mmCIF file with all atom_site columns, C-alpha atoms and ligand atoms in Angstrom:
data_model
loop_
_atom_site.group_PDB
_atom_site.id
_atom_site.type_symbol
_atom_site.label_atom_id
_atom_site.label_alt_id
_atom_site.label_comp_id
_atom_site.label_asym_id
_atom_site.label_entity_id
_atom_site.label_seq_id
_atom_site.pdbx_PDB_ins_code
_atom_site.Cartn_x
_atom_site.Cartn_y
_atom_site.Cartn_z
_atom_site.occupancy
_atom_site.B_iso_or_equiv
_atom_site.pdbx_formal_charge
_atom_site.auth_seq_id
_atom_site.auth_comp_id
_atom_site.auth_asym_id
_atom_site.auth_atom_id
_atom_site.pdbx_PDB_model_num
ATOM   1   C  CA  . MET A 1 1   ? 2.882   34.284 -55.135 1.00 51.05 ? 1   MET A CA  1
ATOM   2   C  CA  . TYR A 1 2   ? -0.062  34.366 -54.377 1.00 49.80 ? 2   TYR A CA  1
ATOM   3   C  CA  . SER A 1 3   ? -2.459  37.245 -53.579 1.00 51.90 ? 3   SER A CA  1
ATOM   4   C  CA  . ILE A 1 4   ? -3.196  38.320 -51.100 1.00 53.28 ? 4   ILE A CA  1
ATOM   5   C  CA  . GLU A 1 5   ? -6.886  37.479 -51.173 1.00 53.57 ? 5   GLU A CA  1
ATOM   6   C  CA  . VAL A 1 6   ? -6.224  34.362 -52.842 1.00 54.71 ? 6   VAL A CA  1
ATOM   7   C  CA  . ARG A 1 7   ? -4.758  33.662 -49.576 1.00 51.71 ? 7   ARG A CA  1
ATOM   8   C  CA  . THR A 1 8   ? -7.052  34.913 -47.148 1.00 52.13 ? 8   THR A CA  1
ATOM   9   C  CA  . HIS A 1 9   ? -10.194 33.195 -49.390 1.00 52.95 ? 9   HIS A CA  1
ATOM   10  C  CA  . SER A 1 10  ? -8.364  29.439 -49.368 1.00 48.49 ? 10  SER A CA  1
ATOM   11  C  CA  . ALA A 1 11  ? -7.823  30.658 -45.459 1.00 49.07 ? 11  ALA A CA  1
ATOM   12  C  CA  . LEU A 1 12  ? -12.051 30.259 -45.323 1.00 50.39 ? 12  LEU A CA  1
ATOM   13  C  CA  . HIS A 1 13  ? -12.067 26.998 -45.386 1.00 47.55 ? 13  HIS A CA  1
ATOM   14  C  CA  . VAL A 1 14  ? -9.429  26.256 -43.070 1.00 45.51 ? 14  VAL A CA  1
ATOM   15  C  CA  . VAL A 1 15  ? -11.300 28.224 -40.732 1.00 45.29 ? 15  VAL A CA  1
ATOM   16  C  CA  . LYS A 1 16  ? -14.322 26.753 -41.225 1.00 45.00 ? 16  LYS A CA  1
ATOM   17  C  CA  . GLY A 1 17  ? -13.262 23.573 -41.143 1.00 44.42 ? 17  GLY A CA  1
ATOM   18  C  CA  . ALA A 1 18  ? -12.038 24.408 -37.270 1.00 43.22 ? 18  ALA A CA  1
ATOM   19  C  CA  . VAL A 1 19  ? -15.583 26.452 -36.489 1.00 43.92 ? 19  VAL A CA  1
ATOM   20  C  CA  . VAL A 1 20  ? -16.560 22.406 -37.580 1.00 41.42 ? 20  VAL A CA  1
ATOM   21  C  CA  . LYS A 1 21  ? -13.882 20.533 -35.278 1.00 40.73 ? 21  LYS A CA  1
ATOM   22  C  CA  . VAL A 1 22  ? -14.991 22.822 -32.214 1.00 41.27 ? 22  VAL A CA  1
ATOM   23  C  CA  . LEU A 1 23  ? -18.723 23.607 -32.008 1.00 42.50 ? 23  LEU A CA  1
ATOM   24  C  CA  . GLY A 1 24  ? -19.529 20.464 -34.242 1.00 45.40 ? 24  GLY A CA  1
ATOM   25  C  CA  . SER A 1 25  ? -22.205 19.594 -36.763 1.00 50.87 ? 25  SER A CA  1
ATOM   26  C  CA  . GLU A 1 26  ? -24.175 22.019 -35.517 1.00 51.66 ? 26  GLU A CA  1
ATOM   27  C  CA  . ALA A 1 27  ? -22.091 24.511 -37.046 1.00 50.07 ? 27  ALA A CA  1
ATOM   28  C  CA  . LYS A 1 28  ? -21.569 23.002 -40.427 1.00 51.65 ? 28  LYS A CA  1
ATOM   29  C  CA  . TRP A 1 29  ? -24.233 25.041 -43.013 1.00 55.71 ? 29  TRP A CA  1
ATOM   30  C  CA  . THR A 1 30  ? -21.347 28.640 -44.433 1.00 58.25 ? 30  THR A CA  1
ATOM   31  C  CA  . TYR A 1 31  ? -24.198 31.212 -44.830 1.00 60.68 ? 31  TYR A CA  1
ATOM   32  C  CA  . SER A 1 32  ? -21.961 33.656 -46.420 1.00 59.57 ? 32  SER A CA  1
ATOM   33  C  CA  . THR A 1 33  ? -18.310 34.495 -46.769 1.00 57.03 ? 33  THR A CA  1
ATOM   34  C  CA  . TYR A 1 34  ? -15.857 37.216 -47.998 1.00 54.86 ? 34  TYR A CA  1
ATOM   35  C  CA  . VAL A 1 35  ? -12.953 39.120 -48.459 1.00 52.85 ? 35  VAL A CA  1
ATOM   36  C  CA  . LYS A 1 36  ? -11.549 42.159 -48.949 1.00 53.72 ? 36  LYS A CA  1
ATOM   37  C  CA  . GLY A 1 37  ? -7.627  43.150 -48.863 1.00 58.43 ? 37  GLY A CA  1
ATOM   38  C  CA  . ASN A 1 38  ? -5.957  40.711 -45.656 1.00 58.33 ? 38  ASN A CA  1
ATOM   39  C  CA  . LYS A 1 39  ? -8.983  40.020 -43.700 1.00 56.47 ? 39  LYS A CA  1
ATOM   40  C  CA  . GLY A 1 40  ? -11.943 37.347 -44.443 1.00 54.03 ? 40  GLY A CA  1
ATOM   41  C  CA  . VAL A 1 41  ? -15.105 36.735 -42.871 1.00 54.52 ? 41  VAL A CA  1
ATOM   42  C  CA  . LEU A 1 42  ? -17.062 32.910 -42.657 1.00 54.68 ? 42  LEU A CA  1
ATOM   43  C  CA  . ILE A 1 43  ? -20.412 32.985 -41.625 1.00 54.23 ? 43  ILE A CA  1
ATOM   44  C  CA  . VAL A 1 44  ? -22.411 29.869 -40.213 1.00 53.50 ? 44  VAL A CA  1
ATOM   45  C  CA  . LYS A 1 45  ? -25.422 29.048 -38.880 1.00 51.72 ? 45  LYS A CA  1
ATOM   46  C  CA  . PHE A 1 46  ? -25.427 28.641 -35.708 1.00 51.83 ? 46  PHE A CA  1
ATOM   47  C  CA  . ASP A 1 47  ? -27.049 29.394 -32.285 1.00 51.87 ? 47  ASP A CA  1
ATOM   48  C  CA  . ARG A 1 48  ? -25.200 30.584 -29.694 1.00 49.99 ? 48  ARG A CA  1
ATOM   49  C  CA  . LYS A 1 49  ? -21.916 32.686 -29.037 1.00 50.48 ? 49  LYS A CA  1
ATOM   50  C  CA  . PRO A 1 50  ? -18.855 30.909 -28.279 1.00 54.42 ? 50  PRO A CA  1
ATOM   51  C  CA  . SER A 1 51  ? -16.925 30.972 -25.411 1.00 53.00 ? 51  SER A CA  1
ATOM   52  C  CA  . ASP A 1 52  ? -13.746 32.775 -25.405 1.00 53.00 ? 52  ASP A CA  1
ATOM   53  C  CA  . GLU A 1 53  ? -11.938 29.459 -25.218 1.00 53.34 ? 53  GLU A CA  1
ATOM   54  C  CA  . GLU A 1 54  ? -13.882 27.910 -28.045 1.00 51.37 ? 54  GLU A CA  1
ATOM   55  C  CA  . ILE A 1 55  ? -12.923 30.841 -30.132 1.00 50.06 ? 55  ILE A CA  1
ATOM   56  C  CA  . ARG A 1 56  ? -9.096  30.957 -28.767 1.00 47.38 ? 56  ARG A CA  1
ATOM   57  C  CA  . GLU A 1 57  ? -9.738  26.276 -30.433 1.00 45.98 ? 57  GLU A CA  1
ATOM   58  C  CA  . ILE A 1 58  ? -11.024 27.230 -32.969 1.00 45.77 ? 58  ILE A CA  1
ATOM   59  C  CA  . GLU A 1 59  ? -8.227  29.873 -34.187 1.00 46.34 ? 59  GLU A CA  1
ATOM   60  C  CA  . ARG A 1 60  ? -5.675  27.181 -32.879 1.00 45.88 ? 60  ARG A CA  1
ATOM   61  C  CA  . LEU A 1 61  ? -6.611  24.870 -34.657 1.00 47.55 ? 61  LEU A CA  1
ATOM   62  C  CA  . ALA A 1 62  ? -6.783  26.433 -37.450 1.00 43.34 ? 62  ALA A CA  1
ATOM   63  C  CA  . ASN A 1 63  ? -3.098  27.620 -37.771 1.00 41.81 ? 63  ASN A CA  1
ATOM   64  C  CA  . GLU A 1 64  ? -1.829  24.358 -36.417 1.00 43.00 ? 64  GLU A CA  1
ATOM   65  C  CA  . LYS A 1 65  ? -3.864  23.274 -40.161 1.00 43.79 ? 65  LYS A CA  1
ATOM   66  C  CA  . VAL A 1 66  ? -1.828  25.695 -41.977 1.00 46.09 ? 66  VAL A CA  1
ATOM   67  C  CA  . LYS A 1 67  ? 1.442   24.503 -40.383 1.00 45.54 ? 67  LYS A CA  1
ATOM   68  C  CA  . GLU A 1 68  ? 0.154   21.039 -41.776 1.00 42.68 ? 68  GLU A CA  1
ATOM   69  C  CA  . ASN A 1 69  ? 0.892   22.308 -44.764 1.00 43.04 ? 69  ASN A CA  1
ATOM   70  C  CA  . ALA A 1 70  ? -1.839  20.373 -46.360 1.00 38.95 ? 70  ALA A CA  1
ATOM   71  C  CA  . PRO A 1 71  ? -3.001  19.854 -49.779 1.00 36.55 ? 71  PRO A CA  1
ATOM   72  C  CA  . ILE A 1 72  ? -6.320  21.712 -51.398 1.00 37.41 ? 72  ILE A CA  1
ATOM   73  C  CA  . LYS A 1 73  ? -7.738  19.299 -53.351 1.00 39.11 ? 73  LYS A CA  1
ATOM   74  C  CA  . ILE A 1 74  ? -9.494  20.649 -56.974 1.00 37.85 ? 74  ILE A CA  1
ATOM   75  C  CA  . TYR A 1 75  ? -12.409 18.290 -57.701 1.00 38.99 ? 75  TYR A CA  1
ATOM   76  C  CA  . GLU A 1 76  ? -14.157 19.208 -60.641 1.00 43.86 ? 76  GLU A CA  1
ATOM   77  C  CA  . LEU A 1 77  ? -17.275 16.909 -61.504 1.00 42.86 ? 77  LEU A CA  1
ATOM   78  C  CA  . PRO A 1 78  ? -20.344 16.154 -63.252 1.00 42.32 ? 78  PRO A CA  1
ATOM   79  C  CA  . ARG A 1 79  ? -23.014 17.721 -60.517 1.00 41.53 ? 79  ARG A CA  1
ATOM   80  C  CA  . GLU A 1 80  ? -25.038 14.163 -60.689 1.00 41.48 ? 80  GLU A CA  1
ATOM   81  C  CA  . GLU A 1 81  ? -21.170 12.730 -59.593 1.00 41.97 ? 81  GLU A CA  1
ATOM   82  C  CA  . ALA A 1 82  ? -20.107 15.630 -57.529 1.00 42.52 ? 82  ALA A CA  1
ATOM   83  C  CA  . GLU A 1 83  ? -23.147 14.427 -55.698 1.00 41.01 ? 83  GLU A CA  1
ATOM   84  C  CA  . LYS A 1 84  ? -22.363 11.054 -55.579 1.00 43.61 ? 84  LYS A CA  1
ATOM   85  C  CA  . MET A 1 85  ? -18.770 11.401 -53.706 1.00 43.14 ? 85  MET A CA  1
ATOM   86  C  CA  . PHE A 1 86  ? -19.356 13.758 -51.362 1.00 44.37 ? 86  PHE A CA  1
ATOM   87  C  CA  . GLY A 1 87  ? -23.097 14.526 -50.340 1.00 42.48 ? 87  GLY A CA  1
ATOM   88  C  CA  . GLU A 1 88  ? -24.999 17.044 -49.334 1.00 42.16 ? 88  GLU A CA  1
ATOM   89  C  CA  . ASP A 1 89  ? -21.608 18.571 -47.218 1.00 41.83 ? 89  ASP A CA  1
ATOM   90  C  CA  . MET A 1 90  ? -20.223 19.864 -50.366 1.00 39.10 ? 90  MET A CA  1
ATOM   91  C  CA  . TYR A 1 91  ? -22.960 22.670 -49.993 1.00 39.77 ? 91  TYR A CA  1
ATOM   92  C  CA  . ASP A 1 92  ? -23.483 25.400 -48.393 1.00 40.71 ? 92  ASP A CA  1
ATOM   93  C  CA  . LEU A 1 93  ? -26.642 26.633 -46.412 1.00 39.84 ? 93  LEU A CA  1
ATOM   94  C  CA  . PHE A 1 94  ? -28.041 27.581 -50.200 1.00 42.27 ? 94  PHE A CA  1
ATOM   95  C  CA  . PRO A 1 95  ? -27.404 25.149 -52.554 1.00 44.10 ? 95  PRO A CA  1
ATOM   96  C  CA  . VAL A 1 96  ? -25.704 26.210 -55.788 1.00 44.48 ? 96  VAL A CA  1
ATOM   97  C  CA  . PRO A 1 97  ? -29.243 26.501 -58.384 1.00 47.85 ? 97  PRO A CA  1
ATOM   98  C  CA  . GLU A 1 98  ? -29.880 23.556 -60.165 1.00 47.65 ? 98  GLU A CA  1
ATOM   99  C  CA  . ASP A 1 99  ? -29.095 25.496 -63.252 1.00 49.23 ? 99  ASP A CA  1
ATOM   100 C  CA  . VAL A 1 100 ? -25.105 24.520 -62.789 1.00 51.24 ? 100 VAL A CA  1
ATOM   101 C  CA  . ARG A 1 101 ? -24.604 21.698 -63.911 1.00 53.64 ? 101 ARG A CA  1
ATOM   102 C  CA  . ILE A 1 102 ? -20.624 21.338 -63.384 1.00 52.06 ? 102 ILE A CA  1
ATOM   103 C  CA  . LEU A 1 103 ? -19.434 21.309 -60.301 1.00 49.77 ? 103 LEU A CA  1
ATOM   104 C  CA  . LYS A 1 104 ? -15.842 21.961 -58.737 1.00 50.14 ? 104 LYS A CA  1
ATOM   105 C  CA  . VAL A 1 105 ? -15.072 20.640 -55.166 1.00 49.47 ? 105 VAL A CA  1
ATOM   106 C  CA  . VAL A 1 106 ? -12.587 22.192 -52.777 1.00 46.25 ? 106 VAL A CA  1
ATOM   107 C  CA  . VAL A 1 107 ? -11.133 19.576 -50.486 1.00 44.31 ? 107 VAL A CA  1
ATOM   108 C  CA  . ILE A 1 108 ? -9.340  19.640 -47.093 1.00 41.92 ? 108 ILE A CA  1
ATOM   109 C  CA  . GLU A 1 109 ? -9.396  15.953 -46.333 1.00 41.25 ? 109 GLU A CA  1
ATOM   110 C  CA  . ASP A 1 110 ? -10.463 15.295 -42.877 1.00 42.81 ? 110 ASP A CA  1
ATOM   111 C  CA  . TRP A 1 111 ? -11.473 19.018 -42.894 1.00 43.59 ? 111 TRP A CA  1
ATOM   112 C  CA  . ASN A 1 112 ? -13.647 20.821 -45.234 1.00 46.62 ? 112 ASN A CA  1
ATOM   113 C  CA  . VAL A 1 113 ? -15.633 20.236 -48.676 1.00 42.75 ? 113 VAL A CA  1
ATOM   114 C  CA  . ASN A 1 114 ? -16.728 22.650 -50.218 1.00 43.89 ? 114 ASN A CA  1
ATOM   115 C  CA  . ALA A 1 115 ? -18.494 23.604 -53.723 1.00 43.75 ? 115 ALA A CA  1
ATOM   116 C  CA  . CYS A 1 116 ? -16.547 26.556 -54.595 1.00 43.32 ? 116 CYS A CA  1
ATOM   117 C  CA  . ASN A 1 117 ? -15.490 28.147 -58.029 1.00 46.17 ? 117 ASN A CA  1
ATOM   118 C  CA  . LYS A 1 118 ? -13.174 30.983 -56.492 1.00 46.40 ? 118 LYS A CA  1
ATOM   119 C  CA  . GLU A 1 119 ? -8.914  30.626 -56.699 1.00 49.75 ? 119 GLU A CA  1
ATOM   120 C  CA  . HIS A 1 120 ? -6.692  28.528 -53.859 1.00 49.61 ? 120 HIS A CA  1
ATOM   121 C  CA  . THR A 1 121 ? -3.389  28.286 -52.479 1.00 50.03 ? 121 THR A CA  1
ATOM   122 C  CA  . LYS A 1 122 ? -1.806  24.836 -53.114 1.00 46.53 ? 122 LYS A CA  1
ATOM   123 C  CA  . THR A 1 123 ? -1.379  24.379 -49.148 1.00 46.30 ? 123 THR A CA  1
ATOM   124 C  CA  . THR A 1 124 ? -2.372  25.206 -46.790 1.00 42.70 ? 124 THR A CA  1
ATOM   125 C  CA  . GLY A 1 125 ? 1.147   26.670 -45.820 1.00 41.34 ? 125 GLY A CA  1
ATOM   126 C  CA  . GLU A 1 126 ? 0.952   29.166 -48.105 1.00 40.75 ? 126 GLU A CA  1
ATOM   127 C  CA  . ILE A 1 127 ? -1.396  31.415 -46.308 1.00 37.42 ? 127 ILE A CA  1
ATOM   128 C  CA  . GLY A 1 128 ? 0.243   31.981 -43.292 1.00 37.91 ? 128 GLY A CA  1
ATOM   129 C  CA  . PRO A 1 129 ? -0.843  32.513 -39.648 1.00 43.74 ? 129 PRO A CA  1
ATOM   130 C  CA  . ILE A 1 130 ? -4.216  33.544 -38.806 1.00 41.92 ? 130 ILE A CA  1
ATOM   131 C  CA  . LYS A 1 131 ? -5.617  35.744 -36.366 1.00 42.76 ? 131 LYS A CA  1
ATOM   132 C  CA  . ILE A 1 132 ? -9.611  36.037 -34.903 1.00 43.16 ? 132 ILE A CA  1
ATOM   133 C  CA  . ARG A 1 133 ? -10.025 39.667 -34.050 1.00 44.08 ? 133 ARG A CA  1
ATOM   134 C  CA  . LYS A 1 134 ? -14.246 40.189 -34.060 1.00 43.44 ? 134 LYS A CA  1
ATOM   135 C  CA  . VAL A 1 135 ? -16.845 37.055 -33.664 1.00 41.16 ? 135 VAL A CA  1
ATOM   136 C  CA  . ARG A 1 136 ? -20.549 38.493 -33.134 1.00 40.57 ? 136 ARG A CA  1
ATOM   137 C  CA  . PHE A 1 137 ? -23.782 36.248 -32.974 1.00 40.97 ? 137 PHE A CA  1
ATOM   138 C  CA  . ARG A 1 138 ? -27.127 37.449 -34.122 1.00 39.92 ? 138 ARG A CA  1
ATOM   139 C  CA  . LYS A 1 139 ? -29.777 35.687 -32.948 1.00 38.95 ? 139 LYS A CA  1
ATOM   140 C  CA  . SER A 1 140 ? -32.665 36.223 -34.308 1.00 37.00 ? 140 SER A CA  1
ATOM   141 C  CA  . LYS A 1 141 ? -31.531 34.893 -37.532 1.00 35.03 ? 141 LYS A CA  1
ATOM   142 C  CA  . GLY A 1 142 ? -29.064 32.373 -36.396 1.00 35.94 ? 142 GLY A CA  1
ATOM   143 C  CA  . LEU A 1 143 ? -26.133 33.431 -37.773 1.00 37.38 ? 143 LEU A CA  1
ATOM   144 C  CA  . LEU A 1 144 ? -22.541 33.467 -36.336 1.00 39.49 ? 144 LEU A CA  1
ATOM   145 C  CA  . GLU A 1 145 ? -19.660 35.915 -38.056 1.00 40.54 ? 145 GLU A CA  1
ATOM   146 C  CA  . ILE A 1 146 ? -16.425 35.024 -37.954 1.00 39.75 ? 146 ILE A CA  1
ATOM   147 C  CA  . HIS A 1 147 ? -14.032 38.121 -38.890 1.00 39.03 ? 147 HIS A CA  1
ATOM   148 C  CA  . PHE A 1 148 ? -10.212 37.535 -38.823 1.00 35.11 ? 148 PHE A CA  1
ATOM   149 C  CA  . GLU A 1 149 ? -7.655  38.320 -40.457 1.00 31.09 ? 149 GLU A CA  1
ATOM   150 C  CA  . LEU A 1 150 ? -4.492  36.902 -42.607 1.00 30.61 ? 150 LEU A CA  1
ATOM   151 C  CA  . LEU A 1 151 ? -1.130  37.601 -41.118 1.00 35.11 ? 151 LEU A CA  1
HETATM 152 ZN ZN1 . LIG B 2 .   ? -12.876 28.903 -51.903 1.00 35.14 ? 201 LIG B ZN1 1
#
């Protein structure tokens, strides 16, 4: 089976996709992410605190993607090829340093594309129900934190 950490990290990709679907391209750049147990935190560059409605919709879409049990594809490509294939969208706010010449790219079709070297579940269904616990907007820094728990 997959550890709760691997499942929670995989959830970050699902939640990020939902975030972009609801908030739009203005929220496409991830500042950072981290997992501790069954708790995951996604921080993206954004300019406002979403409404409770928007937060609920992000949660709904995330769970719906998990329910769809879509495959989580992993691409291991030379950096140059990865860029031609996925473009800038595969990067986070801070692009992978140039000394890294081979990239592993995670892909959830029409949902999320991200250069990531961590371990993931094979499908989104293996993640399980997700619950957003806290959302915090840091105005000065222009960062939106989404704290969730994998039930
Ligand atoms: Zn990942």
